[PDB]
Amino acid sequence: GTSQWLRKTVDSAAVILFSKTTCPYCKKVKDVLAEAKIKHATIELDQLSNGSAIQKCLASFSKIETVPQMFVRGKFIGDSQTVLKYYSNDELAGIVNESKYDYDLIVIGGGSGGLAAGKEAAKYGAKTAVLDYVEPTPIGTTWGLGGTCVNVGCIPKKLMHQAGLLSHALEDAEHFGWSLDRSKISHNWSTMVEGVQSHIGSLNWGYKVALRDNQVTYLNAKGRLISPHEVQITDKNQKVSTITGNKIILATGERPKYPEIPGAVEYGITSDDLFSLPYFPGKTLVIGASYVALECAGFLASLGGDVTVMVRSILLRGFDQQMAEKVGDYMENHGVKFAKLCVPDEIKQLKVVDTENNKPGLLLVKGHYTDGKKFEEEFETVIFAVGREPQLSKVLCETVGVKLDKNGRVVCTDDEQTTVSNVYAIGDINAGKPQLTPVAIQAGRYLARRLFAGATELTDYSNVATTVFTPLEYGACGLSEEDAIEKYGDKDIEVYHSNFKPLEWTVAHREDNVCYMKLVCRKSDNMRVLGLHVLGPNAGEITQGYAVAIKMGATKADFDRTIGIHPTCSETFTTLHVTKKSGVSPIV
Amino acid sequence: GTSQWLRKTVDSAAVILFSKTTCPYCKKVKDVLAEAKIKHATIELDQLSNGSAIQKCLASFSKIETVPQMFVRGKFIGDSQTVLKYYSNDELAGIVNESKYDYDLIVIGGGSGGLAAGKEAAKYGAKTAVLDYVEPTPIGTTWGLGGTCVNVGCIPKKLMHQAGLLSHALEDAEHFGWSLDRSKISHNWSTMVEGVQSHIGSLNWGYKVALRDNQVTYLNAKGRLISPHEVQITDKNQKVSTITGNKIILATGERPKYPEIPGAVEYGITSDDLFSLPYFPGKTLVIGASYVALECAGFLASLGGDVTVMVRSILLRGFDQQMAEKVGDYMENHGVKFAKLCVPDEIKQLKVVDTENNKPGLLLVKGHYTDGKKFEEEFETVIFAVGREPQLSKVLCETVGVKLDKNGRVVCTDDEQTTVSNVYAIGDINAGKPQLTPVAIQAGRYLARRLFAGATELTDYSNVATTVFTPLEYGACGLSEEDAIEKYGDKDIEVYHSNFKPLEWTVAHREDNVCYMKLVCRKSDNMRVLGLHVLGPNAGEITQGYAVAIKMGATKADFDRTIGIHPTCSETFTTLHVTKKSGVSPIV
Numbered sequence A, B: 001g002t003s004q005w006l007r008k009t010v011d012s013a014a015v016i017l018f019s020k021t022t023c024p025y026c027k028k029v030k031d032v033l034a035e036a037k038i039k040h041a042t043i044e045l046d047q048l049s050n051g052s053a054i055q056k057c058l059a060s061f062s063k064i065e066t067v068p069q070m071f072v073r074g075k076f077i078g079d080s081q082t083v084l085k086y087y088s089n090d091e092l093a094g095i096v097n098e099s100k101y102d103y104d105l106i107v108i109g110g111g112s113g114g115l116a117a118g119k120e121a122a123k124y125g126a127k128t129a130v131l132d133y134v135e136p137t138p139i140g141t142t143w144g145l146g147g148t149c150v151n152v153g154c155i156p157k158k159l160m161h162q163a164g165l166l167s168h169a170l171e172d173a174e175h176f177g178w179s180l181d182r183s184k185i186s187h188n189w190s191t192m193v194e195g196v197q198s199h200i201g202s203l204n205w206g207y208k209v210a211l212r213d214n215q216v217t218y219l220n221a222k223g224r225l226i227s228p229h230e231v232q233i234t235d236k237n238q239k240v241s242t243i244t245g246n247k248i249i250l251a252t253g254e255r256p257k258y259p260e261i262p263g264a265v266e267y268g269i270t271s272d273d274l275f276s277l278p279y280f281p282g283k284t285l286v287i288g289a290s291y292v293a294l295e296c297a298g299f300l301a302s303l304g305g306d307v308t309v310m311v312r313s314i315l316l317r318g319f320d321q322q323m324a325e326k327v328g329d330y331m332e333n334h335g336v337k338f339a340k341l342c343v344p345d346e347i348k349q350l351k352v353v354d355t356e357n358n359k360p361g362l363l364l365v366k367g368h369y370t371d372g373k374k375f376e377e378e379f380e381t382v383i384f385a386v387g388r389e390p391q392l393s394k395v396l397c398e399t400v401g402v403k404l405d406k407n408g409r410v411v412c413t414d415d416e417q418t419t420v421s422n423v424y425a426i427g428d429i430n431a432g433k434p435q436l437t438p439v440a441i442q443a444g445r446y447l448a449r450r451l452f453a454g455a456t457e458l459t460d461y462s463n464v465a466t467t468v469f470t471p472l473e474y475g476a477c478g479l480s481e482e483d484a485i486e487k488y489g490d491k492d493i494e495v496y497h498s499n500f501k502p503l504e505w506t507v508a509h510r511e512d513n514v515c516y517m518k519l520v521c522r523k524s525d526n527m528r529v530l531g532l533h534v535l536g537p538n539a540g541e542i543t544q545g546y547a548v549a550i551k552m553g554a555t556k557a558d559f560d561r562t563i564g565i566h567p568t569c570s571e572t573f574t575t576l577h578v579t580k581k582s583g584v585s586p587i588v
């Protein structure tokens, strides 16, 4: 058991020192490695409970049983005397740079997961290359290093959400005694985009500075895995070449889908284009009903736009549907229009985009409702939010042997390994995993520690909390109510719930019984909390902390015995008492 | 053991039915009581661990072993047939109403704990009186039902905190694209107070409605305990009388102190006066350094007041002093002035308050610094926040025999019992307990269930999370860093920490390395989280959820294995890695 671990650690680690915290000979070796700017992992045998077994097992590689022992890419290099001999003979640099491959690690994709994996591997002396390329959108949009979240996802999305929330702050300000008049104030889209883009650009630069200071090679080129160890690259001059690496991490992400109707690609846009659009969208049609669709329609409406969402069937498929409808109801009461049970049939161009005067075009949209009645209306912008997908055929020659599932995602073991022993996958292309930025970062850093530092910790993908940043936010951790009932039966599930009103909403004369929270519990497992749900301001700040308690197996009794913080919205979770079976109203 | 619980429950309950869910003879008795509108507790024996043992023990009181059995104030009343005989004969009302005392429970004090205890007791059939009276401040300020939090504490102070937070929202809105000029907007104090006071009044009225619909007798009267079961009352006409109750709960709270110096009571005010002050305070001096003092100085400055705080020694005594100093540093850089190591000697009047034209007076404050140097400066308002204390000699005749401590607070067992067997104390006057509103509510609700419904659950007073609502908020759960070092030794403590910047602050050009958080951990106990600390926006919402995890014994690895919600401030707790021992900078 220990022997299998040691052999896997020695085989993949780039440079690794087996040591003890007391030993001065180990310290002497540490000092020479630092002075020569040699990065390496280190394992302190006296810190691990079975260090005695590991010490003995090292002899199977080195013929010796003492510390220090230093290895390079699977080969024993020597003890203290031998290492210093290589140092004072100027032989040591060539020893540690000896490799069958160009790099110890090649990362394909410079986004959330890939940057995280690459920076971490480099800390333990792995020679690392990170490749990133941004295929332009149909109208040409492109952006810098860092991936979807940084450039065209979480970061610009929540910044524009914040600009929307500030509209209600200006409203609420009058009731708390400030002299402004909200009705005389308007919003300038291009001023907002300029500010958002400036922050995004400082992240683009920050990541390039980070890869430089960690000694990671950054290639702005499109990568393609042609054999288990061979990556073909194409640069911005279409020059083609091949690089090799020992371990390969795939982290190339997804891009937005388009519906297969005439005029879509030509005359509409997606979220990839929206966050740097040089003109206000104007009257806008959003097609879709995912969180991306609803969040985008949500802040466009708060910024003052005329917005419609075209919904094929339901909102937020895959989320708790009672919560989903409350989310929708709030948007519809606050100026978002919905076209329900409706799908688009074609887009016609009435005006070309006025690139000079900086104005949108004009489009005619035709569709139909599920009963067959007709939809026809004009909009200035059409935004498609109908899902996202990878295109791994552009990354992965089928002959390499990497297995994919029905949806084109990569089938991995619980340690991110693909069907090819030296290739791994992380992030949105890892089949069946939650498609979220912090998941992709944790997977990437933990994998790098397993490959190059002998770590064993795995990424835990269960009960990861979410927040949908709609105008009233929706946070969750665990199972939806319908999922819990499906799995255990209605008789074994209890639901505690309550409305609430933020204290900030009192003086501002906002709604009495719109915000809502529930806990979904299992009767037979000591009232274990199966899922938590909250609709309200700052839902992500509210929810995050409870994710640790749910991770630890929290029950209703743990919620009850914890005392609230007053006055907060989140304290309502600590005093819940009305069950759904009781039929008592949850208003307050 | 079971015997003694059943004894305690029967002698204390007002009206209690021992039942089984399956039995139709019980259903028959429940319905008769519901129709006659008799409230009562119910113990379902088929839903308890040893319900079969209680069945046999019930015979000691009733000589029967069957179910249902009904008791009134310790006395067995009858089985199914006997209750129906009393009901058919019009004998039931007089049986359930007969008592040695006027009330089953008298609550002295209508505040956070008192109202919570009284409502809960009335649910289980206890005949309940709640007494509340608000002795005026020296300038005559007075308010309605609800206690300190509702009228002159948590609720008005956080509402005024929000009015101050909205000032930075107006500033931020320009950077996010809105067309307003913050420099041309001003605040109106009295418009704010009117909105605040109208909401407080909707809570005064709601409590009076809630007591009525629970059949609780509300007496706007000053109560005094003269004997174990005898409460003397004095109404608004100074008419005196005596009522008697079985159980007594003292819940009378505290009031603010004044320093023993000339002119203070005459010419200064306290928080009791601030929340309904009819004029803007003007140039203000706050004397003290508790959370009250800093919270008030904080929003006065944000509303555009000229504010100074005078500090004897340190800020926020009893809280983590690193956090405390970061709190004050933020205030000082955003326009609160501090006069450190300074105390007051006397207050002189220069102008009287102009009550007609609605203007403050003018005062001269004389004091000295800790070295010997002198303080002299004029202010329009002077607010004292130098602590709070009870005045139990008003409430409680020393001949009754209720033991107080050296501070004047009630010494209680862990179930809130005083030295007199039927008298209990809850809330701020309970010695050694955290003085917080959710604590008082839980103590009062749980005690009511032990008295009248046979509950056994106690209030847990440990690791209760707090939030200080200064201009930059500060939340905490558990031990300060210094307290952990002292209790366990510096070699057994590891502290993880990190600065952070909210995403919302990026586009609005706010500070980079001001918000800050840390986990105080015990090495020798699996890196248990001893205390959590966070300085930043929405700190109460952030902290609350982790209180549940800390209650359950969370460790650093529990925080590590939980995934973050992105983008939030709170997610920074899920990736902490820089330790203080390592000396690495926590900046970002």
Ligand SMILES: Cc1cc2nc3c(=O)[nH]c(=O)nc-3n(C[C@H](O)[C@H](O)[C@H](O)COP(=O)(O)OP(=O)(O)OC[C@H]3O[C@@H](n4cnc5c(N)ncnc54)[C@H](O)[C@@H]3O)c2cc1C
Pocket (backbone or CB within 6 Å): A108, A109, A110, A111, A112, A113, A114, A131, A132, A133, A134, A135, A146, A147, A148, A149, A150, A152, A153, A154, A155, A157, A221, A222, A223, A224, A251, A252, A253, A254, A271, A292, A394, A395, A426, A427, A428, A429, A435, A436, A437, A438, A440, B566, B567
């Ligand atoms: C509008 C929107 C909002 C979102 N909001 C949130 C949110 O609030 N919270 C959250 O947790 N998640 C959010 N997400 C999801 C989050 O962006 C993703 O889960 C995350 O970016 C996944 O990271 P990744 O490393 O898997 O891929 P990516 O971040 O997409 O990075 C992959 C990179 O590889 C590049 N690449 C592709 N093919 C090649 C190739 N052949 N050669 C070289 N480079 C290549 C891509 O151009 C890209 O730069 C949002 C997504 C969207 C679209």
Ligand SMILES: Cc1cc2nc3c(=O)[nH]c(=O)nc-3n(C[C@H](O)[C@H](O)[C@H](O)COP(=O)(O)OP(=O)(O)OC[C@H]3O[C@@H](n4cnc5c(N)ncnc54)[C@H](O)[C@@H]3O)c2cc1C
Pocket (backbone or CB within 6 Å): A566, A567, B108, B109, B110, B111, B112, B113, B114, B131, B132, B133, B134, B135, B146, B147, B148, B149, B150, B152, B153, B154, B155, B157, B221, B222, B223, B224, B251, B252, B253, B254, B271, B292, B394, B395, B426, B427, B428, B429, B435, B436, B437, B438, B440
């Ligand atoms: C400025 C300020 C801000 C605060 N902010 C917070 C906060 O954000 N969060 C928090 O958790 N806590 C806060 N607190 C503390 C919180 O208000 C108290 O812990 C809580 O009010 C205590 O409740 P209680 O039931 O013990 O007493 P109280 O709420 O004070 O109620 C006691 C009541 O009994 C009345 N009474 C007194 N003597 C008699 C008598 N003889 N007969 C009849 N009635 C009598 C009193 O007049 C009062 O109405 C704050 C306190 C202050 C002063």
Ligand SMILES: N#CCC(=O)N1CCC(C(N)=O)CC1
Pocket (backbone or CB within 6 Å): A135, A136, A137, A138, A255, A256, A257, A258, A259, A260, A265
């Ligand atoms: N259907 C369909 C067409 C389609 O989805 N395209 C839009 C995205 C473009 C890109 N971002 O690389 C090219 C491919």
Ligand SMILES: N#CCC(=O)N1CCC(C(N)=O)CC1
Pocket (backbone or CB within 6 Å): B135, B136, B137, B138, B255, B256, B257, B258, B259, B260, B265
């Ligand atoms: N209620 C009320 C307010 C009140 O009566 N005062 C409390 C402090 C007293 C003092 N320390 O000299 C002055 C009187």
